DNA sequence: GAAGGGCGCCTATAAAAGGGGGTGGGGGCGTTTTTTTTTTTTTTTTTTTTCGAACACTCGAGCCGAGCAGACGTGCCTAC
DNA sequence: GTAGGCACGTCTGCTCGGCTCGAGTGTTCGATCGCGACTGAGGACGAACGCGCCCCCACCCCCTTTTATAGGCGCCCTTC
């Protein structure tokens, strides 16, 4: 199951206009997981306004 | 009947594992590593060498 | 398998998952250019990826 | 009968010449058939988690078009 | 000049042929984690095979007899 996955998406990536593209050059995503941000520097926290 | 034959062996050179029809064997009773087989599996030019 | 071979991509890489032979039998039939813009094409052909 | 003894043929060498015979060397036919009804067996049939679709193919089926035939309508001939 | 009746034309529906549809059956593909790391399988590798035996041909050999020379031995016959 893991290499199978792999074998698909290895071709995506960010480009430097930071639109998602794969191999063709198609569009995958406008930015990087809706809005640009990396995975390691994310916390969880807490929304006030829903109280 | 030698067309029949050409056209065996040339397709078992390329390729060595046609459905319904014989494979090629050595005197050890061993299929032949035809072209497509050794480019096909894990061990094959595509993914163990290449 | 009989998925990711519908998509665009060049022949190339679409060999190095399990069609091996098959693939590039359709790829030479049809005449098919593949760009080596992708990441596997790029390291099968030893030059630097991308 | 069993056993030991005596007589005689055996193989080698030679060397020739005529003719029958053998093991080939190579090509042919690829048979068809005689049956023995066969080693081609069931591998494991599966012990299954089996597909995993995709694609080709099967067979049937239903809508639709043209032609045909009768009913309805029109066109043509005869009689007062 | 005019009206009724028989044949032909018009219209609609039934039958046949033509065109496209799927549940079903078939094929047929495929992969089955990573790595190891050891030997040692090192004797092979028994299968080689006739495939099926067939005829034509080519070439070499066996086939008698001579005589001397000698072990090896098969057979007959008398004695045990």
């Given at each position: 199951?893991?290499?199978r996955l792999?074998?698909?998406?290895?071709?995506?990536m960010?480009?430097?206009?930071?639109?998602?593209r794969?191999?063709?050059?198609?569009?995958?995503?406008?930015?990087?997981?809706?809005?640009?941000?990396?995975?390691?520097?994310?916390?969880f926290?807490?929304?006030?306004?829903?109280? | 009947?030698?067309?029949?034959?050409?056209?065996?062996?040339?397709?078992?050179?390329?390729?060595?594992?046609?459905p319904?029809?014989?494979?090629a064997?050595?005197?050890?009773?061993?299929?032949?590593?035809?072209?497509?087989?050794?480019?096909?599996?894990?061990?094959?030019?595509?993914?163990?060498?290449? | 398998?009989?998925?990711?071979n519908?998509?665009?991509?060049?022949?190339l890489?679409?060999?190095?998952?399990?069609?091996?032979?098959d693939?590039?039998?359709?790829?030479?039939?049809?005449?098919?250019?593949?760009?080596m813009?992708?990441?596997?094409?790029?390291?099968?052909?030893?030059?630097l990826?991308?």
């Open positions: 199951i893991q290499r792999i074998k698909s998406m290895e071709s995506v960010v480009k430097y206009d930071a639109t998602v794969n191999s063709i050059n198609q569009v995958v995503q406008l930015r990087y997981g809706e809005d640009g941000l990396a995975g390691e520097s994310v916390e926290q807490n929304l006030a306004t829903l109280k | 009947e030698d067309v029949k034959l050409l056209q065996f062996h040339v397709a078992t050179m390329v390729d060595n594992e046609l319904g029809l014989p494979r064997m050595q005197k050890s009773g061993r299929p032949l590593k035809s072209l497509k087989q050794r480019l096909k599996g894990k061990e094959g030019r595509v993914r163990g060498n290449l | 398998r009989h998925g990711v519908r998509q665009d991509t060049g022949p890489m679409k060999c190095s998952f399990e069609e091996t032979v693939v590039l039998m359709e790829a030479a039939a049809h005449g098919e250019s593949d760009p813009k992708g990441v596997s094409e790029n390291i099968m052909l030893g030059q990826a991308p």
